Amino acid sequence: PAYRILKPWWDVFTDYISIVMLMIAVFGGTLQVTQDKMICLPCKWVTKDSCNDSTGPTGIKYDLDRHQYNYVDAVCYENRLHWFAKYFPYLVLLHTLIFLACSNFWF
Amino acid sequence: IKYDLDRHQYNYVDAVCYENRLHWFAKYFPYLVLLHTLIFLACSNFWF
Amino acid sequence: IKFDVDCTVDIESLTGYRTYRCAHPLATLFKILASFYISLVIFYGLIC
Amino acid sequence: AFRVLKPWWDVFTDYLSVAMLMIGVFGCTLQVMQDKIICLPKRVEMKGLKTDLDLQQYSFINQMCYERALHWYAKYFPYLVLIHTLVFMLCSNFWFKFPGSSSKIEGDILYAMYVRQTVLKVIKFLIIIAYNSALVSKVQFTVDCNVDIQDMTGYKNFSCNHTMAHLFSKLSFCYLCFVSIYGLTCLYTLYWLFY
Amino acid sequence: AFRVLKPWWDVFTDYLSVAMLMIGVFGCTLQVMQDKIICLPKRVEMKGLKTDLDLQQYSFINQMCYERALHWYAKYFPYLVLIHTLVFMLCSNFWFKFPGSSSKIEHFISILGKCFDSKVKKFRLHVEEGDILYAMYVRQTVLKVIKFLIIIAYNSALVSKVQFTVDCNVDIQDMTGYKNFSCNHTMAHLFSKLSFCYLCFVSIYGLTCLYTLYWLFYRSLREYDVKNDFAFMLHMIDQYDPLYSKRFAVFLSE
């Protein structure tokens, strides 16, 4: 199309900026989809709902099978991880989509 | 705590509980959405 | 966005512990991307 | 206004930038998928050396040492390369993209922008080398981390190995070569503005 | 300026280069995804042989032995093939990516089309003053022959280097409790046949280059009258199609 003359310089700059933001949203979204986990270890010595943290060394034994670690990972990731840490790429994608909609609404 | 369940027993119970006692609207939401959007598109472009 | 969190999810009947310390491996990268995104948004807002 | 106006050196720089972008994409894919650090506690016919650590403890050790010990250049090399290559491509095509210059090419403002672009590219080459040359040797296939994860794992000293480092050693080095040649085809351009 | 400029040996080289690039990309994908080494400690109705090694210890041994013991050629064969194929393709297409030859060949195609439809005086002035294009083509073919010879000669020895089984004596003791390990490279036996096919393709590429040597060094194409550049650019189209020379020779005749 010949509409390229109707776009000022700042509109081209905002188109490129929106493309870059969309690219980083896609990247942070696939990364969040394919790898985002929590790695949880229980704390044996608790002080006020917090980890006190207080002849070679031998590893501590928690007596938890793998599936219990998976379950605690899922629960902690669902409840005690702030939503902005989890839904950052989706919010970025939504904001870029609505920015692009605003940019090209009159066309 | 200990349950004395090997990994495959956990996988089997996951499969059974996922098939039986998970609401279908959680399992088959995207397929319903895909079907509804496909029929919406077929309605919009039927005359063309 | 923090690399390590502490969750008192309060499920002892299933695991037997009170509080857990967890690592969020993508937290640092997500913080980097968040800073990059807010810089881009700042440029976008200046232009607008 | 896209084919005949490109000289030989501009096209060759475009080819080199495309190769650098491909290398950066490959590095980013490897970082996304197959980038992890494998750790072991340092100080515990021949039998094994069991340390009685469950898999989740090993994963926690791996992530703690990976985030705390490893130098950020090894971790965030492909993203840095991708950003630099994208900036190079953007500043090379800016002589066409800009509407004020696009309308004219399709006052002397047209030439000052080219001079500024060449200056920016030369400065980019200098600053890229400044830390790439001094930080390539930073990466090591092995590493030793002393991390405060005792009373969670029972150990304090860990020997770890970063799997991708070797390929990164074979990658960044080669990437540096693609910088140097590019630098020539950059500097030559600047010379044509002054010679 | 695309089809008439390609002799049959050039098309064979192009197709072989495409196949080699495909092989290289496939090898790179396999290396990225499924390349790994499985390791075991050397020496501790039948029973087990419990070495009481954790999974993490096994993985650490795997990575150490794979990075150290495994031969560099086994680790970098796909990228090696990729680089060689890229150099071949870039060398072949550089003759037309170069702006000067792009100016020469474009004018040559324009005048050839005009002579086929039914400047030549200016052509025999500005174009016959060359002969550097014939030398450039000869040097490119010689470079391709050099690459083929070097590749085959050095690859025929290192191809046998890749082995399914492998051994590593690595100072992993006091971390695992062993020193000697027997390992296997799972895809090594596939890499052997992959490299053999690559060698066959490179050999056919070299034979095509050798026949191009016969074409370039049998009848002294410098003269044919026309200068060396025009004689070479006439022989090229003659090889592509024997007829177009008859329809181009008309306008030269006075």
PDB file of N, CA, C and O in Angstrom, chain D residues 12-77:
ATOM      1  N   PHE D  12      28.231  -6.292   2.025  1.00  0.00           N
ATOM      2  CA  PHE D  12      29.055  -7.243   2.769  1.00  0.00           C
ATOM      3  C   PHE D  12      28.841  -7.102   4.274  1.00  0.00           C
ATOM      4  O   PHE D  12      28.798  -8.104   4.999  1.00  0.00           O
ATOM      5  N   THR D  13      28.695  -5.866   4.761  1.00  0.00           N
ATOM      6  CA  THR D  13      28.365  -5.662   6.167  1.00  0.00           C
ATOM      7  C   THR D  13      26.990  -6.227   6.495  1.00  0.00           C
ATOM      8  O   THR D  13      26.780  -6.764   7.585  1.00  0.00           O
ATOM      9  N   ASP D  14      26.036  -6.101   5.569  1.00  0.00           N
ATOM     10  CA  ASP D  14      24.726  -6.707   5.782  1.00  0.00           C
ATOM     11  C   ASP D  14      24.839  -8.221   5.906  1.00  0.00           C
ATOM     12  O   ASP D  14      24.212  -8.829   6.783  1.00  0.00           O
ATOM     13  N   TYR D  15      25.637  -8.845   5.039  1.00  0.00           N
ATOM     14  CA  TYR D  15      25.836 -10.291   5.118  1.00  0.00           C
ATOM     15  C   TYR D  15      26.480 -10.690   6.440  1.00  0.00           C
ATOM     16  O   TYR D  15      26.062 -11.668   7.077  1.00  0.00           O
ATOM     17  N   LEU D  16      27.502  -9.945   6.868  1.00  0.00           N
ATOM     18  CA  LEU D  16      28.154 -10.252   8.136  1.00  0.00           C
ATOM     19  C   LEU D  16      27.198 -10.075   9.307  1.00  0.00           C
ATOM     20  O   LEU D  16      27.209 -10.874  10.250  1.00  0.00           O
ATOM     21  N   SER D  17      26.371  -9.029   9.273  1.00  0.00           N
ATOM     22  CA  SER D  17      25.396  -8.822  10.336  1.00  0.00           C
ATOM     23  C   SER D  17      24.352  -9.927  10.356  1.00  0.00           C
ATOM     24  O   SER D  17      23.898 -10.327  11.430  1.00  0.00           O
ATOM     25  N   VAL D  18      23.962 -10.436   9.185  1.00  0.00           N
ATOM     26  CA  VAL D  18      23.031 -11.560   9.147  1.00  0.00           C
ATOM     27  C   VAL D  18      23.672 -12.805   9.748  1.00  0.00           C
ATOM     28  O   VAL D  18      23.029 -13.554  10.494  1.00  0.00           O
ATOM     29  N   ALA D  19      24.946 -13.050   9.435  1.00  0.00           N
ATOM     30  CA  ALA D  19      25.640 -14.188  10.034  1.00  0.00           C
ATOM     31  C   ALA D  19      25.743 -14.037  11.549  1.00  0.00           C
ATOM     32  O   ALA D  19      25.544 -15.005  12.296  1.00  0.00           O
ATOM     33  N   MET D  20      26.056 -12.828  12.019  1.00  0.00           N
ATOM     34  CA  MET D  20      26.134 -12.577  13.456  1.00  0.00           C
ATOM     35  C   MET D  20      24.779 -12.767  14.122  1.00  0.00           C
ATOM     36  O   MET D  20      24.695 -13.303  15.232  1.00  0.00           O
ATOM     37  N   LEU D  21      23.706 -12.322  13.465  1.00  0.00           N
ATOM     38  CA  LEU D  21      22.363 -12.538  13.990  1.00  0.00           C
ATOM     39  C   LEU D  21      22.032 -14.022  14.068  1.00  0.00           C
ATOM     40  O   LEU D  21      21.420 -14.476  15.038  1.00  0.00           O
ATOM     41  N   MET D  22      22.415 -14.790  13.047  1.00  0.00           N
ATOM     42  CA  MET D  22      22.172 -16.229  13.078  1.00  0.00           C
ATOM     43  C   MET D  22      22.929 -16.888  14.223  1.00  0.00           C
ATOM     44  O   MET D  22      22.384 -17.745  14.931  1.00  0.00           O
ATOM     45  N   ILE D  23      24.186 -16.491  14.427  1.00  0.00           N
ATOM     46  CA  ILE D  23      24.968 -17.034  15.534  1.00  0.00           C
ATOM     47  C   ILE D  23      24.338 -16.658  16.871  1.00  0.00           C
ATOM     48  O   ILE D  23      24.269 -17.479  17.793  1.00  0.00           O
ATOM     49  N   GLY D  24      23.862 -15.418  16.995  1.00  0.00           N
ATOM     50  CA  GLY D  24      23.209 -15.006  18.226  1.00  0.00           C
ATOM     51  C   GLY D  24      21.931 -15.774  18.496  1.00  0.00           C
ATOM     52  O   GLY D  24      21.648 -16.142  19.637  1.00  0.00           O
ATOM     53  N   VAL D  25      21.138 -16.019  17.453  1.00  0.00           N
ATOM     54  CA  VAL D  25      19.911 -16.797  17.608  1.00  0.00           C
ATOM     55  C   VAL D  25      20.235 -18.222  18.033  1.00  0.00           C
ATOM     56  O   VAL D  25      19.562 -18.797  18.899  1.00  0.00           O
ATOM     57  N   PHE D  26      21.263 -18.819  17.425  1.00  0.00           N
ATOM     58  CA  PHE D  26      21.682 -20.159  17.825  1.00  0.00           C
ATOM     59  C   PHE D  26      22.110 -20.189  19.288  1.00  0.00           C
ATOM     60  O   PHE D  26      21.728 -21.095  20.043  1.00  0.00           O
ATOM     61  N   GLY D  27      22.894 -19.196  19.710  1.00  0.00           N
ATOM     62  CA  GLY D  27      23.314 -19.136  21.099  1.00  0.00           C
ATOM     63  C   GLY D  27      22.149 -18.954  22.053  1.00  0.00           C
ATOM     64  O   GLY D  27      22.110 -19.566  23.123  1.00  0.00           O
ATOM     65  N   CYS D  28      21.187 -18.108  21.683  1.00  0.00           N
ATOM     66  CA  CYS D  28      20.009 -17.912  22.521  1.00  0.00           C
ATOM     67  C   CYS D  28      19.174 -19.179  22.621  1.00  0.00           C
ATOM     68  O   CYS D  28      18.654 -19.490  23.695  1.00  0.00           O
ATOM     69  N   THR D  29      19.029 -19.916  21.517  1.00  0.00           N
ATOM     70  CA  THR D  29      18.308 -21.183  21.567  1.00  0.00           C
ATOM     71  C   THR D  29      19.008 -22.176  22.486  1.00  0.00           C
ATOM     72  O   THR D  29      18.360 -22.853  23.295  1.00  0.00           O
ATOM     73  N   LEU D  30      20.336 -22.274  22.380  1.00  0.00           N
ATOM     74  CA  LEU D  30      21.070 -23.172  23.266  1.00  0.00           C
ATOM     75  C   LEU D  30      20.920 -22.756  24.722  1.00  0.00           C
ATOM     76  O   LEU D  30      20.739 -23.606  25.601  1.00  0.00           O
ATOM     77  N   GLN D  31      20.991 -21.452  24.995  1.00  0.00           N
ATOM     78  CA  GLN D  31      20.805 -20.963  26.357  1.00  0.00           C
ATOM     79  C   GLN D  31      19.416 -21.305  26.877  1.00  0.00           C
ATOM     80  O   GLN D  31      19.257 -21.708  28.034  1.00  0.00           O
ATOM     81  N   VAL D  32      18.396 -21.145  26.034  1.00  0.00           N
ATOM     82  CA  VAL D  32      17.029 -21.445  26.445  1.00  0.00           C
ATOM     83  C   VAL D  32      16.884 -22.923  26.776  1.00  0.00           C
ATOM     84  O   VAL D  32      16.331 -23.294  27.817  1.00  0.00           O
ATOM     85  N   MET D  33      17.398 -23.791  25.907  1.00  0.00           N
ATOM     86  CA  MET D  33      17.103 -25.215  26.036  1.00  0.00           C
ATOM     87  C   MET D  33      18.162 -25.960  26.849  1.00  0.00           C
ATOM     88  O   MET D  33      17.852 -26.550  27.888  1.00  0.00           O
ATOM     89  N   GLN D  34      19.412 -25.931  26.396  1.00  0.00           N
ATOM     90  CA  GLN D  34      20.454 -26.814  26.908  1.00  0.00           C
ATOM     91  C   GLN D  34      21.531 -26.070  27.694  1.00  0.00           C
ATOM     92  O   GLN D  34      22.720 -26.364  27.566  1.00  0.00           O
ATOM     93  N   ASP D  35      21.137 -25.101  28.520  1.00  0.00           N
ATOM     94  CA  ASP D  35      22.075 -24.368  29.365  1.00  0.00           C
ATOM     95  C   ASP D  35      21.768 -24.673  30.823  1.00  0.00           C
ATOM     96  O   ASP D  35      20.778 -24.176  31.373  1.00  0.00           O
ATOM     97  N   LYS D  36      22.617 -25.482  31.448  1.00  0.00           N
ATOM     98  CA  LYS D  36      22.479 -25.787  32.862  1.00  0.00           C
ATOM     99  C   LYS D  36      23.854 -26.097  33.431  1.00  0.00           C
ATOM    100  O   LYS D  36      24.782 -26.462  32.706  1.00  0.00           O
ATOM    101  N   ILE D  37      23.970 -25.946  34.747  1.00  0.00           N
ATOM    102  CA  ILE D  37      25.215 -26.160  35.472  1.00  0.00           C
ATOM    103  C   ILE D  37      25.039 -27.378  36.362  1.00  0.00           C
ATOM    104  O   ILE D  37      24.066 -27.459  37.120  1.00  0.00           O
ATOM    105  N   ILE D  38      25.976 -28.318  36.279  1.00  0.00           N
ATOM    106  CA  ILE D  38      25.914 -29.542  37.071  1.00  0.00           C
ATOM    107  C   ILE D  38      26.908 -29.436  38.216  1.00  0.00           C
ATOM    108  O   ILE D  38      28.103 -29.217  37.991  1.00  0.00           O
ATOM    109  N   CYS D  39      26.417 -29.600  39.442  1.00  0.00           N
ATOM    110  CA  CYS D  39      27.195 -29.359  40.646  1.00  0.00           C
ATOM    111  C   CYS D  39      27.324 -30.625  41.478  1.00  0.00           C
ATOM    112  O   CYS D  39      26.479 -31.521  41.413  1.00  0.00           O
ATOM    113  N   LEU D  40      28.392 -30.681  42.268  1.00  0.00           N
ATOM    114  CA  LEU D  40      28.594 -31.708  43.275  1.00  0.00           C
ATOM    115  C   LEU D  40      29.208 -31.069  44.509  1.00  0.00           C
ATOM    116  O   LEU D  40      29.951 -30.086  44.398  1.00  0.00           O
ATOM    117  N   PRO D  41      28.907 -31.591  45.696  1.00  0.00           N
ATOM    118  CA  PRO D  41      29.612 -31.124  46.895  1.00  0.00           C
ATOM    119  C   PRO D  41      31.093 -31.452  46.806  1.00  0.00           C
ATOM    120  O   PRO D  41      31.485 -32.513  46.319  1.00  0.00           O
ATOM    121  N   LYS D  42      31.919 -30.532  47.302  1.00  0.00           N
ATOM    122  CA  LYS D  42      33.359 -30.640  47.091  1.00  0.00           C
ATOM    123  C   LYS D  42      33.988 -31.677  48.016  1.00  0.00           C
ATOM    124  O   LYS D  42      34.561 -32.670  47.556  1.00  0.00           O
ATOM    125  N   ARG D  43      33.888 -31.463  49.321  1.00  0.00           N
ATOM    126  CA  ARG D  43      34.583 -32.275  50.314  1.00  0.00           C
ATOM    127  C   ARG D  43      33.557 -33.098  51.080  1.00  0.00           C
ATOM    128  O   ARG D  43      32.780 -32.552  51.870  1.00  0.00           O
ATOM    129  N   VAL D  44      33.560 -34.406  50.851  1.00  0.00           N
ATOM    130  CA  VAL D  44      32.629 -35.301  51.523  1.00  0.00           C
ATOM    131  C   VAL D  44      32.986 -35.424  52.999  1.00  0.00           C
ATOM    132  O   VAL D  44      32.171 -35.121  53.869  1.00  0.00           O
ATOM    133  N   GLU D  45      39.830 -52.471  43.638  1.00  0.00           N
ATOM    134  CA  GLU D  45      38.389 -52.262  43.726  1.00  0.00           C
ATOM    135  C   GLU D  45      38.057 -50.994  44.503  1.00  0.00           C
ATOM    136  O   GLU D  45      38.547 -50.787  45.613  1.00  0.00           O
ATOM    137  N   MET D  46      37.222 -50.146  43.910  1.00  0.00           N
ATOM    138  CA  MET D  46      36.802 -48.896  44.524  1.00  0.00           C
ATOM    139  C   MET D  46      35.291 -48.764  44.430  1.00  0.00           C
ATOM    140  O   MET D  46      34.686 -49.134  43.420  1.00  0.00           O
ATOM    141  N   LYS D  47      34.689 -48.236  45.488  1.00  0.00           N
ATOM    142  CA  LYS D  47      33.248 -48.058  45.559  1.00  0.00           C
ATOM    143  C   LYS D  47      32.887 -46.585  45.413  1.00  0.00           C
ATOM    144  O   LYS D  47      33.742 -45.697  45.454  1.00  0.00           O
ATOM    145  N   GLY D  48      31.593 -46.335  45.242  1.00  0.00           N
ATOM    146  CA  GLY D  48      31.094 -44.992  45.051  1.00  0.00           C
ATOM    147  C   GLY D  48      31.331 -44.103  46.259  1.00  0.00           C
ATOM    148  O   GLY D  48      31.837 -44.515  47.302  1.00  0.00           O
ATOM    149  N   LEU D  49      30.943 -42.843  46.100  1.00  0.00           N
ATOM    150  CA  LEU D  49      31.198 -41.788  47.075  1.00  0.00           C
ATOM    151  C   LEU D  49      29.897 -41.100  47.458  1.00  0.00           C
ATOM    152  O   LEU D  49      29.766 -39.876  47.398  1.00  0.00           O
ATOM    153  N   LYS D  50      28.904 -41.904  47.843  1.00  0.00           N
ATOM    154  CA  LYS D  50      27.551 -41.409  48.066  1.00  0.00           C
ATOM    155  C   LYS D  50      27.531 -40.237  49.038  1.00  0.00           C
ATOM    156  O   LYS D  50      28.189 -40.256  50.082  1.00  0.00           O
ATOM    157  N   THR D  51      26.770 -39.205  48.674  1.00  0.00           N
ATOM    158  CA  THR D  51      26.610 -38.007  49.487  1.00  0.00           C
ATOM    159  C   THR D  51      25.192 -37.854  50.018  1.00  0.00           C
ATOM    160  O   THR D  51      24.885 -36.834  50.640  1.00  0.00           O
ATOM    161  N   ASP D  52      24.329 -38.840  49.777  1.00  0.00           N
ATOM    162  CA  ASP D  52      22.941 -38.884  50.250  1.00  0.00           C
ATOM    163  C   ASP D  52      22.238 -37.536  50.081  1.00  0.00           C
ATOM    164  O   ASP D  52      21.797 -36.899  51.038  1.00  0.00           O
ATOM    165  N   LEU D  53      22.139 -37.113  48.824  1.00  0.00           N
ATOM    166  CA  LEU D  53      21.388 -35.928  48.434  1.00  0.00           C
ATOM    167  C   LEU D  53      20.279 -36.339  47.479  1.00  0.00           C
ATOM    168  O   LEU D  53      20.542 -37.001  46.471  1.00  0.00           O
ATOM    169  N   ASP D  54      19.047 -35.955  47.795  1.00  0.00           N
ATOM    170  CA  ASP D  54      17.953 -36.223  46.879  1.00  0.00           C
ATOM    171  C   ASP D  54      18.025 -35.273  45.686  1.00  0.00           C
ATOM    172  O   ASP D  54      18.736 -34.266  45.694  1.00  0.00           O
ATOM    173  N   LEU D  55      17.261 -35.611  44.646  1.00  0.00           N
ATOM    174  CA  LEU D  55      17.370 -34.892  43.381  1.00  0.00           C
ATOM    175  C   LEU D  55      17.008 -33.423  43.540  1.00  0.00           C
ATOM    176  O   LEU D  55      17.640 -32.552  42.934  1.00  0.00           O
ATOM    177  N   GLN D  56      15.986 -33.129  44.345  1.00  0.00           N
ATOM    178  CA  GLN D  56      15.590 -31.740  44.548  1.00  0.00           C
ATOM    179  C   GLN D  56      16.709 -30.933  45.193  1.00  0.00           C
ATOM    180  O   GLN D  56      16.903 -29.757  44.866  1.00  0.00           O
ATOM    181  N   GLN D  57      17.456 -31.546  46.113  1.00  0.00           N
ATOM    182  CA  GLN D  57      18.592 -30.851  46.708  1.00  0.00           C
ATOM    183  C   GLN D  57      19.653 -30.539  45.664  1.00  0.00           C
ATOM    184  O   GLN D  57      20.240 -29.451  45.670  1.00  0.00           O
ATOM    185  N   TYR D  58      19.928 -31.490  44.769  1.00  0.00           N
ATOM    186  CA  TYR D  58      20.881 -31.234  43.695  1.00  0.00           C
ATOM    187  C   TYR D  58      20.403 -30.101  42.801  1.00  0.00           C
ATOM    188  O   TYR D  58      21.197 -29.250  42.391  1.00  0.00           O
ATOM    189  N   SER D  59      19.106 -30.074  42.484  1.00  0.00           N
ATOM    190  CA  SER D  59      18.574 -28.995  41.658  1.00  0.00           C
ATOM    191  C   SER D  59      18.718 -27.648  42.355  1.00  0.00           C
ATOM    192  O   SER D  59      19.081 -26.646  41.728  1.00  0.00           O
ATOM    193  N   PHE D  60      18.426 -27.607  43.655  1.00  0.00           N
ATOM    194  CA  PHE D  60      18.569 -26.366  44.405  1.00  0.00           C
ATOM    195  C   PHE D  60      20.016 -25.900  44.437  1.00  0.00           C
ATOM    196  O   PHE D  60      20.285 -24.703  44.278  1.00  0.00           O
ATOM    197  N   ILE D  61      20.954 -26.825  44.641  1.00  0.00           N
ATOM    198  CA  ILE D  61      22.371 -26.476  44.600  1.00  0.00           C
ATOM    199  C   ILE D  61      22.741 -25.927  43.232  1.00  0.00           C
ATOM    200  O   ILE D  61      23.439 -24.910  43.121  1.00  0.00           O
ATOM    201  N   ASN D  62      22.278 -26.593  42.171  1.00  0.00           N
ATOM    202  CA  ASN D  62      22.590 -26.153  40.817  1.00  0.00           C
ATOM    203  C   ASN D  62      22.110 -24.732  40.588  1.00  0.00           C
ATOM    204  O   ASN D  62      22.859 -23.886  40.094  1.00  0.00           O
ATOM    205  N   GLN D  63      20.868 -24.440  40.971  1.00  0.00           N
ATOM    206  CA  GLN D  63      20.330 -23.112  40.705  1.00  0.00           C
ATOM    207  C   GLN D  63      20.985 -22.047  41.573  1.00  0.00           C
ATOM    208  O   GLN D  63      21.278 -20.950  41.082  1.00  0.00           O
ATOM    209  N   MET D  64      21.240 -22.343  42.850  1.00  0.00           N
ATOM    210  CA  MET D  64      21.910 -21.369  43.705  1.00  0.00           C
ATOM    211  C   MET D  64      23.299 -21.037  43.179  1.00  0.00           C
ATOM    212  O   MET D  64      23.650 -19.861  43.029  1.00  0.00           O
ATOM    213  N   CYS D  65      24.104 -22.060  42.881  1.00  0.00           N
ATOM    214  CA  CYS D  65      25.446 -21.798  42.374  1.00  0.00           C
ATOM    215  C   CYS D  65      25.399 -21.123  41.009  1.00  0.00           C
ATOM    216  O   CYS D  65      26.224 -20.251  40.715  1.00  0.00           O
ATOM    217  N   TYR D  66      24.439 -21.505  40.162  1.00  0.00           N
ATOM    218  CA  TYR D  66      24.326 -20.911  38.836  1.00  0.00           C
ATOM    219  C   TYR D  66      24.012 -19.426  38.917  1.00  0.00           C
ATOM    220  O   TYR D  66      24.595 -18.619  38.185  1.00  0.00           O
ATOM    221  N   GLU D  67      23.091 -19.044  39.799  1.00  0.00           N
ATOM    222  CA  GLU D  67      22.726 -17.637  39.898  1.00  0.00           C
ATOM    223  C   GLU D  67      23.772 -16.822  40.644  1.00  0.00           C
ATOM    224  O   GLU D  67      23.995 -15.655  40.304  1.00  0.00           O
ATOM    225  N   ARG D  68      24.425 -17.403  41.649  1.00  0.00           N
ATOM    226  CA  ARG D  68      25.321 -16.623  42.494  1.00  0.00           C
ATOM    227  C   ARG D  68      26.769 -16.662  42.016  1.00  0.00           C
ATOM    228  O   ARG D  68      27.433 -15.622  41.965  1.00  0.00           O
ATOM    229  N   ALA D  69      27.279 -17.844  41.673  1.00  0.00           N
ATOM    230  CA  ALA D  69      28.701 -17.974  41.381  1.00  0.00           C
ATOM    231  C   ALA D  69      29.045 -17.492  39.979  1.00  0.00           C
ATOM    232  O   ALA D  69      29.890 -16.607  39.812  1.00  0.00           O
ATOM    233  N   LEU D  70      28.413 -18.077  38.962  1.00  0.00           N
ATOM    234  CA  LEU D  70      28.827 -17.856  37.582  1.00  0.00           C
ATOM    235  C   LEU D  70      28.781 -16.377  37.218  1.00  0.00           C
ATOM    236  O   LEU D  70      27.825 -15.671  37.550  1.00  0.00           O
ATOM    237  N   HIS D  71      29.825 -15.913  36.533  1.00  0.00           N
ATOM    238  CA  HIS D  71      29.899 -14.518  36.119  1.00  0.00           C
ATOM    239  C   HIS D  71      28.860 -14.234  35.043  1.00  0.00           C
ATOM    240  O   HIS D  71      28.601 -15.069  34.173  1.00  0.00           O
ATOM    241  N   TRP D  72      28.264 -13.040  35.105  1.00  0.00           N
ATOM    242  CA  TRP D  72      27.097 -12.753  34.277  1.00  0.00           C
ATOM    243  C   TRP D  72      27.420 -12.783  32.790  1.00  0.00           C
ATOM    244  O   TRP D  72      26.517 -12.972  31.969  1.00  0.00           O
ATOM    245  N   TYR D  73      28.687 -12.593  32.417  1.00  0.00           N
ATOM    246  CA  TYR D  73      29.033 -12.637  31.001  1.00  0.00           C
ATOM    247  C   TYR D  73      28.762 -14.014  30.413  1.00  0.00           C
ATOM    248  O   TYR D  73      28.258 -14.130  29.291  1.00  0.00           O
ATOM    249  N   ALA D  74      29.096 -15.071  31.152  1.00  0.00           N
ATOM    250  CA  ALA D  74      28.818 -16.420  30.673  1.00  0.00           C
ATOM    251  C   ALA D  74      27.320 -16.663  30.552  1.00  0.00           C
ATOM    252  O   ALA D  74      26.862 -17.295  29.593  1.00  0.00           O
ATOM    253  N   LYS D  75      26.542 -16.173  31.520  1.00  0.00           N
ATOM    254  CA  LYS D  75      25.101 -16.397  31.507  1.00  0.00           C
ATOM    255  C   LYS D  75      24.424 -15.640  30.370  1.00  0.00           C
ATOM    256  O   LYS D  75      23.615 -16.209  29.628  1.00  0.00           O
ATOM    257  N   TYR D  76      24.735 -14.353  30.221  1.00  0.00           N
ATOM    258  CA  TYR D  76      23.977 -13.464  29.349  1.00  0.00           C
ATOM    259  C   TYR D  76      24.754 -13.063  28.098  1.00  0.00           C
ATOM    260  O   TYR D  76      24.563 -11.967  27.567  1.00  0.00           O
ATOM    261  N   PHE D  77      25.641 -13.935  27.624  1.00  0.00           N
ATOM    262  CA  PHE D  77      26.353 -13.666  26.377  1.00  0.00           C
ATOM    263  C   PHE D  77      25.438 -13.628  25.155  1.00  0.00           C
ATOM    264  O   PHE D  77      25.517 -12.651  24.386  1.00  0.00           O
TER     265      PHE D  77
END
